[PDB]
């Protein structure tokens, strides 16, 4: 009678990521980010952010959204120096002060806790990021190689998308950045967005989260009520905190996302 071992209800980031490679490594190694422990083998699943730049995290109340975003930002910072990565945060509920060490923050206005701050920061970011757009001049050998510009990748770490949408009036938030999203891989842009499950369905059809979702961004479906998001592809159901059905074009599987105090 074989011994039972199930997906543990709490896995620390150091258990998921005991041997992180460092800034010394190449781009591919620096952006192979562990995001959780698979139920099938207690082995890390990864965000291949060197190829698909984004990650979406959907979840009901107290399902672990903020902590997971914290933990994944840490795994990214373990792999990348402040010359290789910079973080801009949307943190309306003010829970991500320590998600990133102040060495890796994108300037003095990196942490935005309200609409006025975020609008200004997103304006400045889009102006800077558009400078990295690929010319039609160059050769496709330079396209995947991203050789026409050098600098840090930008991670847009966005907690509680539903609040940003609600506090934006009727205007779309991230309007300056949404047009650049098709070129995210070419300009080194990564968005990591959490959203309450009750609004995540509406979010999958907007121009920011929906652009990443419709283009195959890996998506954690944490605990939620099936009727908030009933599409049978994803198995939206009540889950322990941190447990998620991870969906990408690369497959669908149950993971335990990392915890961090
Ligand atoms: N990866 C995880 N694994 C297990 N438990 C977790 C994990 N992350 C968070 N938790 C637990 O779940 C609780 C809620 O965590 P957290 O605030 O991150 O979720 P949330 O979705 O941001 O909640 P809120 O609805 O307040 O925004 C915490 O008390 C924490 O102990
Ligand atoms: Mg939260």
Numbering used by the authors: 318 to 578
What does the paper behind this entry write?
EccC, the motor subunit of T7SS, is essential to assemble a stable membrane complex for the secretion process. In this study, we have provided high-resolution crystal structures of ATPase3 domains of EccC proteins from Mtb, all in complex with ATP. In our structures, ATP and a magnesium ion bind to the nucleotide-binding site in a similar manner.
Firstly, we solved the structure of the ATPase3 domain of EccCb1 from Mtb at 2.10 Å resolution. EccCb1-ATPase3 crystallized with two molecules in the asymmetric unit. The adenosine ring of ATP is clamped in place by Arg327, Pro558, and Tyr576 and surrounded by Thr384, Ile385, Gln573, Ala574 and Pro575. The β- and γ-phosphates and Thr383, together with three water molecules are ligands for the Mg2+, and they form a regular octahedron around this ion. Interestingly, the two Asp residues (Asp476 and Asp477) in the Walker B motif, which usually contribute to stabilization of the Mg2+ ion, are too far away to interact directly with the Mg2+ ion in our model.
